Design an enzyme around this catalytic site. Structure first.
Site, mmCIF file in Angstrom:
data_model
loop_
_atom_site.group_PDB
_atom_site.id
_atom_site.type_symbol
_atom_site.label_atom_id
_atom_site.label_comp_id
_atom_site.label_asym_id
_atom_site.label_seq_id
_atom_site.Cartn_x
_atom_site.Cartn_y
_atom_site.Cartn_z
ATOM 1 N N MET A 50 34.656 10.886 3.178
ATOM 2 C CA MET A 50 35.168 10.781 4.541
ATOM 3 C C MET A 50 34.527 9.621 5.289
ATOM 4 O O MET A 50 33.318 9.357 5.144
ATOM 5 C CB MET A 50 34.947 12.085 5.330
ATOM 6 C CG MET A 50 33.499 12.369 5.741
ATOM 7 S SD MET A 50 33.360 13.794 6.840
ATOM 8 C CE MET A 50 34.036 13.136 8.373
ATOM 9 N N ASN A 51 35.347 8.947 6.093
ATOM 10 C CA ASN A 51 34.862 8.036 7.128
ATOM 11 C C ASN A 51 35.021 8.683 8.508
ATOM 12 O O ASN A 51 34.769 9.880 8.631
ATOM 13 C CB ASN A 51 35.492 6.645 6.976
ATOM 14 C CG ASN A 51 35.266 6.062 5.579
ATOM 15 O OD1 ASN A 51 34.159 6.099 5.061
ATOM 16 N ND2 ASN A 51 36.319 5.561 4.966
ATOM 17 N N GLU A 52 35.433 7.923 9.519
ATOM 18 C CA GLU A 52 35.416 8.431 10.878
ATOM 19 C C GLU A 52 36.443 9.550 11.115
ATOM 20 O O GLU A 52 37.482 9.638 10.441
ATOM 21 C CB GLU A 52 35.576 7.290 11.908
ATOM 22 C CG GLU A 52 36.911 6.586 11.846
ATOM 23 C CD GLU A 52 36.915 5.349 10.958
ATOM 24 O OE1 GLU A 52 36.066 5.231 10.040
ATOM 25 O OE2 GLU A 52 37.799 4.485 11.181
ATOM 26 N N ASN B 261 39.260 9.583 1.610
ATOM 27 C CA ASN B 261 39.435 8.770 0.405
ATOM 28 C C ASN B 261 39.270 9.684 -0.812
ATOM 29 O O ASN B 261 38.165 9.818 -1.335
ATOM 30 C CB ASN B 261 38.383 7.639 0.435
ATOM 31 C CG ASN B 261 38.415 6.737 -0.798
ATOM 32 O OD1 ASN B 261 39.178 6.943 -1.750
ATOM 33 N ND2 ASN B 261 37.566 5.709 -0.767
ATOM 34 N N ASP C 130 43.488 1.305 15.372
ATOM 35 C CA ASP C 130 42.761 2.460 15.887
ATOM 36 C C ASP C 130 43.298 2.910 17.238
ATOM 37 O O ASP C 130 42.539 3.046 18.183
ATOM 38 C CB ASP C 130 41.261 2.169 16.012
ATOM 39 C CG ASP C 130 40.624 1.743 14.703
ATOM 40 O OD1 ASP C 130 41.222 1.927 13.617
ATOM 41 O OD2 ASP C 130 39.492 1.209 14.765
ATOM 42 N N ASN D 268 27.233 8.297 8.120
ATOM 43 C CA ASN D 268 27.048 7.563 6.872
ATOM 44 C C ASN D 268 27.300 6.089 7.138
ATOM 45 O O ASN D 268 28.435 5.626 7.105
ATOM 46 C CB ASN D 268 27.966 8.030 5.726
ATOM 47 C CG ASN D 268 27.806 7.143 4.505
ATOM 48 O OD1 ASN D 268 26.767 6.484 4.365
ATOM 49 N ND2 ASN D 268 28.826 7.089 3.639
#
Length: 493
Positions: free
Chosen positions: A18-20, A38, A153, A297
């Site tokens: 995971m990102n944001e 992802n 975004d 992260n």
């Protein structure tokens, strides 16, 4: 690590990376969490929106992918909002739609356009708008010098004062946000840019503007509300690289006019691992909280976790209040946490002197520890968490320079990234009674440290051995009176 460093009370994806966070919205009794996911679990993987839900911001139920990569347009970051009047026409009168706006990233060409998705089952399932993209590269090109490679975004909300939908779009290295209006969520019109050069007190070092959010915030108390823009610039943060800041100002439906910023108060985190913050929209006024979460992260693929990567910060309120006489953004863990925590040790009005070590019997990897104390002049109070024979993560208060520090030099595995160790710092003053307050959320691979009323926050990943589960509270250079210490164990049910 025996358990792949899985956090026990912070969100992580069921599997993979995971990102944001994305599209944070409350729908009825359900908090919705989406995020950049992802599932390929390598750096070249296609991004989609993952999804989880909860009733308490803590016990998350994993859901299927909400918005898929398809044809090959990846589903990059964005936000959500309720359309109760069905201005989009995508629902109906009995069933108005919830909407999500997201950047479509065309992998092969690297274009970034804006897209819409809608839910008519209260957020359970989402359908991509057939007319996507809702803002094409051609429409972006007059406002994006890359011709549509650097427009992303979207933060979207309905602006009651003007009766228009508003989109705030980030332009990366162009160091601006653009503002757009729509009557129907689909047909947009550019109105203004917020540069960089217009914001007094904002360093030129702060570049690569990403992940905007925007909302009205009570300024207290004083019946006043203000507009807030929050964003994650890619450079310039206290700990270096990406970080989250917030700006106050006025908004007329077309342009945001920034108040001056002060660099010493605008950043929402002084640690490495808090980026891409968004807030939950559609929270009922009876609750009334502005609650934010971000990914922890900052190290890309480098953390030593195999079946997952990336974790959500513990949800925290964002408020504006005076701390003594100065207005600050202050952050505090949501009060829901208190329902899953239990005291293992409490101290009240205990004197600590050099040579003493307190909290020595505690064993835990999931802890919420509060320390409030009156330090002697020139004293240094140290709270070591995740402590083993040769490992510890040390939170220090140095009275003489009013500094809160988090030292990861001996935390455990700091081999995985050059930025994994070191010392992070924030200014933290005694209050008007002489009291210094520190709170630390400890989990399997993280610390989140809150100073004072929450004007100082340091969030960082750590990778200690599972056996590094002790605490040590010590003082040097003087004594301290510990007004209160509360060491709580945290467990989900």
């Amino acid at each position: 690590q025996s358990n792949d460093y899985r956090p026990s009370y912070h969100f992580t994806p069921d599997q993979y990376w995971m990102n944001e966070p994305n599209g944070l919205i409350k729908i009825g009794s359900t908090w919705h969490l989406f995020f950049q996911h992802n599932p390929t679990a390598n750096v070249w993987g296609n991004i989609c929106w993952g999804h989880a839900t909860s009733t308490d911001l803590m016990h998350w139920a994993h859901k299927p992918t909400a918005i898929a990569d398809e044809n090959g347009v990846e589903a990059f970051t964005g936000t959500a909002y309720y359309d109760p009047n069905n201005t989009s026409g995508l629902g109906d009168s009995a069933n108005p739609p919830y909407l999500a706006w997201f950047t479509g990233y065309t992998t092969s060409s690297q274009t970034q356009d804006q897209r819409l998705a809608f839910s008519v089952d209260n957020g359970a399932t989402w359908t991509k708008f057939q007319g996507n993209p809702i803002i094409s590269t051609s429409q972006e090109a007059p406002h994006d010098i890359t011709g549509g490679l650097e427009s992303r975004d979207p933060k979207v909300f309905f602006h009651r004062q003007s009766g228009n939908w508003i989109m705030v779009l980030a332009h990366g290295g162009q160091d601006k946000l653009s503002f757009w209006t729509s009557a129907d969520t689909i047909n947009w019109t550019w109105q203004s840019d917020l540069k960089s050069t217009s914001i007094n007190g904002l360093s030129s070092d702060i570049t690569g503007w990403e992940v905007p959010d925007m909302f009205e915030l009570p300024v207290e108390g004083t019946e006043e509300t203000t507009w807030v823009v929050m964003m994650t610039p890619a450079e310039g943060s206290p700990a270096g690289g990406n970080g989250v800041l917030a700006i106050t100002g006025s908004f007329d439906g077309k342009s945001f006019t920034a108040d001056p910023v002060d660099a010493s108060t605008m950043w929402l985190d002084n640690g490495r691992d808090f980026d891409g913050a968004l807030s939950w929209v559609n929270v009922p006024a009876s609750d009334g909280r502005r609650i934010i979460a971000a990914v922890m992260n900052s190290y890309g693929s480098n953390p030593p976790t195999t079946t997952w990567k990336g974790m959500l910060s513990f949800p925290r309120t964002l408020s504006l209040k005076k701390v003594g006489t100065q207005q600050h953004f202050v952050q505090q863990p949501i009060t829901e946490l208190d329902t899953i925590s239990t005291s293992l040790q409490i101290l009240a009005n205990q004197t600590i002197t050099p040579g003493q070590t307190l909290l020595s019997s505690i064993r835990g990897t999931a802890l919420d520890v509060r320390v409030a104390f009156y330090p002697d002049a020139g004293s240094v109070l140290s709270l070591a968490v995740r402590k083993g024979a040769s490992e510890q993560t040390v939170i220090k208060y140095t009275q003489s320079d009013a500094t809160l520090s988090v030292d990861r030099t001996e935390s455990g595995d700091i081999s995985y990234d050059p930025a994994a160790g070191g010392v992070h710092t924030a200014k933290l003053e005694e209050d008007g009674t002489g009291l210094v307050s520190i709170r630390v959320l400890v989990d399997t691979c993280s610390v989140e440290v809150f100073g004072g009323q929450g004007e100082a926050v340091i969030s960082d990943l750590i990778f200690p051995s599972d056996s590094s589960d002790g605490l040590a509270l010590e003082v040097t250079g003087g004594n301290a009176v510990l007004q209160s210490v509360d060491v709580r164990s945290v467990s989900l049910e």
